[PDB]
């Protein structure tokens, strides 16, 4: 009697805000949403293709009505009864323009100002090709405190080639089915890759049908999945109106089901980049240290090519690693740019490209900084540590120039060593290690329950390290004897 | 200098309409004037153009319907950060 998808986002131990929908026209008289969704008078859509358009047969409301119902329907919705305002940016044939979408986003910004400051969620169940201006408009809205949620796209492709999917500050949602596997749609299916933040139910989703005011229908697509996460965001903000986007994103990530997806469905080179997360409501209206992993784009084959991974503005970058499938890399470093710490990975002169991999955390009232030492030519290698009192080591980085090679970093003698140090109230971190004589393909070590992985690293002196990265609270080192080094923290 | 951008997916391209994005901190009256400047320049070259919208509040700039012939001209306007060709978005 409970739709599988509503059960699926509901955790074991299971509680003001406005949701804007930019989509097709909606049927606001439908029993699922009546009196709770308002149709704004905004609409900016292209003409239908008249050679295939028969107005009398067409159901112009079908897509938007169903999505409003998934978000806030009284019987089948995620945030039942939630308040919604709809804007029409898609015509009867499901088509809109980047320009119309911009004008719709501007309209929302306009409303936010003259209306009583409160949390707002914007659901964008649509996609086009990568657009610089559309991504920029979304970023600008996100920095004004708006939570934007969008579909990853239905093309079984890398979501970073689409917008607004590829906008970093937007929450991008892929679709999974009742078996928690990626949805197939025709011969295609949910998009994937590093621009997808998480997945949510997106197959066989029951919801309001505009056929009639009490009618229901089942639909599939990443639109439906994004609608689930918009509902979840709405329930979270309804209980904690003060929650910021950064905090909300970290919580969505933290409370999702981990590792329920078989990654074999994704192309091989996307498996490491794609989060294995299926959305769920936090079992809680509501302290702990949240961190997430952020992969950069591939650097490219150039000998001097670099990749950059950045954190959200409210976040601190606590560590920085790098990965190359070929293994040919020159390490990584944490640099300052615009008074913000970024993670820069450097490519080897014979390499095809590297990823930079940042670890981004919410650490209130933290003052972090980087400390570097140049190469040494010593038996103890190159070393740096956090001198200042109350400053804790949260991560180590190392980059070198040549090709062939408590609270302290140790790197190769030929390499520069970089240490991330933070001062924050009650911050304590410790190191955990694990080595294996015969590296079968990867060495890992995880932080104990209650601790958060902030740094992930391999011990220097090895020739067969492809790189290292955090997966949730596990540190993963990739080899072609090797030791994985985790830095784990918490706030007492 | 000012760059031009278009959708990588050729069939989703909508040539003939462009978002002209101006450098940030550009004020509304400046975007308004830059749009009218483009129109006057294009008119002297025998081109009809239409300003469809002038943005303020999210991004500074304007939406213009015009021939792609004029892109080089538009890229030389004062305050221009970059210009993007309109393109389609689709229900998912």
């Amino acid at each position: 009697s409970i739709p599988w998808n509503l059960e699926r986002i509901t955790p074991p131990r299971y509680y003001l805000v406005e949701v804007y929908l930019l989509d097709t026209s909606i049927q606001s008289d439908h029993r699922e949403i009546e009196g709770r969704v308002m149709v704004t008078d905004f609409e900016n859509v292209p003409e239908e293709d008249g050679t295939r358009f028969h107005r009398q047969a067409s159901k112009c409301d079908s897509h938007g009505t169903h999505l409003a119902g998934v978000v806030s329907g009284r019987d089948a919705g995620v945030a039942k009864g939630a308040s919604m305002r709809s804007l029409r940016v898609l015509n009867c044939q499901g088509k809109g323009t980047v320009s119309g979408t911009l004008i719709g986003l501007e309209f929302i910004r306009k409303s936010q100002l003259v209306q009583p400051v409160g949390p707002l969620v914007v659901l964008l169940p649509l996609a086009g090709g990568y657009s610089r201006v559309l991504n920029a408009a979304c970023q600008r809205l996100a920095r004004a405190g708006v939570v934007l949620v969008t579909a990853a796209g239905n093309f079984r492709d890398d979501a970073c080639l689409y917008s607004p999917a590829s906008a970093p500050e937007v929450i991008t949602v892929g679709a999974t089915n009742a078996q928690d596997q990626p949805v197939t749609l025709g011969t295609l299916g949910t998009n994937f890759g590093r621009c997808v933040d998480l997945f949510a139910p997106g197959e066989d989703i029951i919801g309001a049908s505009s056929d009639c005011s009490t009618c229901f229908v089942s639909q599939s697509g990443t639109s439906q999945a994004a609608a689930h996460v918009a509902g979840i965001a709405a329930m979270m903000l309804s209980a904690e109106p003060e929650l910021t986007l950064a905090e909300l994103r970290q919580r969505l990530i933290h409370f999702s089901a981990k590792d329920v997806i078989n990654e074999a469905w994704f192309p091989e080179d996307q498996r490491v980049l794609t989060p294995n997360l299926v959305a769920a409501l936090p079992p809680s209206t509501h302290w702990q240290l949240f961190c997430r992993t952020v992969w950069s784009a591939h650097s490219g084959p150039t000998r001097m090519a670099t990749a950059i991974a950045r954190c959200a503005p409210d976040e601190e970058l606590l560590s920085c690693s790098s990965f190359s499938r070929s293994g040919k890399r020159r390490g990584e470093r944490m640099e300052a740019q615009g008074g913000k710490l970024v993670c820069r990975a450097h490519n080897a002169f014979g390499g095809e490209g590297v990823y930079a991999i940042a670890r981004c955390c919410l650490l209130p009232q933290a003052a972090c900084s980087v400390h570097t030492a140049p190469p040494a030519e010593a038996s103890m290698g190159t070393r740096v540590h956090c001198h200042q009192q109350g400053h804790v080591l949260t991560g180590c980085s190392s980059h070198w120039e040549v090709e062939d090679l408590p609270n302290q970093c140790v790197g190769h003698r030929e390499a520069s060593i970089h240490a991330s140090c933070c001062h924050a109230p009650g911050l304590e971190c410790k190191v955990k290690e694990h080595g294996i004589p015969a590296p079968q393909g990867q060495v890992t070590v995880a932080c104990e329950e209650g601790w958060t992985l902030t740094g992930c690293s391999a011990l220097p002196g090895t020739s067969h390290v492809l790189g290292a990265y955090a997966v949730d609270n596990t540190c993963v080192v990739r080899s072609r004897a090797v030791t994985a080094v985790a830095i784990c923290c918490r706030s007492r | 200098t000012a760059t031009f951008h278009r959708c990588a997916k050729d069939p989703w391209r909508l040539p003939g309409t462009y978002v002209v994005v101006l450098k940030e901190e550009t004020h509304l009256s400046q975007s308004e004037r830059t749009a009218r400047r483009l129109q006057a320049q294009a008119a002297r070259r025998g081109y009809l153009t239409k300003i469809l919208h002038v943005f303020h509040g999210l991004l500074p700039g304007f939406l213009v319907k015009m021939s792609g012939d004029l892109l080089e001209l538009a890229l030389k306007l004062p305050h221009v950060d970059y210009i993007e060709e309109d393109s389609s978005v689709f229900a998912q």
Partner: antibody
Amino acid sequence: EVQLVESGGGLVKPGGSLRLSCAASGFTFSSYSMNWVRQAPGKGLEWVSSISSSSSYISYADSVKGRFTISRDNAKNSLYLQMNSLRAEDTAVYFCARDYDFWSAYYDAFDVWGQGTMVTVSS
Amino acid sequence: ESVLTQPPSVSGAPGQRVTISCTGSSSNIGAGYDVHWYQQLPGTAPKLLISGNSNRPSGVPDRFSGSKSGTSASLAITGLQAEDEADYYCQSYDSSLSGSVFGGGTKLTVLG
């Protein structure tokens, strides 16, 4: 499993009418476009008509334009083809086939077909 | 009389490699629409063989491959097997017709 079963075929005289149905099961019908494709005995496949998931795209081959009318009923998981003013040349097996509705963003393959229903038009 | 042109027939012995071409125009294949291929065994419904120019559905052996170039596309079958005897159809959307039309079909015969 995913399944399509068309019915309604028969023998009819020139100038007459038939109504084909196609029942879908095993999948989310309301997110798929549907199509009729026909094949005269010993001949090639011929696209007849297409209708999108919300019926906002509808089109017809020239050869049936004005005589055939496609429609669908998502609540009943059904696709219809109303055939009027039938001619001998309309004699063929008629298949239905689905393709996921990408709203013209992409035109996917017809990835599942029915087994077809036979239609003969003869004096 | 079909918008897409295929050779009427092709043949090979078990083990050989054969190809089937599909040529269209600027209103379909040359307009950026993908070609999809179908196999129809004698007395059955068509089934999907290659989608999106070159993708194989689950259950289709890697002996089958497809490619597209310009206004034409090609289906290739290596290690020809007896059960490959069938008719093969290409398909592509055509923007002037507003429909996804089919080639005239190629009859493949397994010899030897």
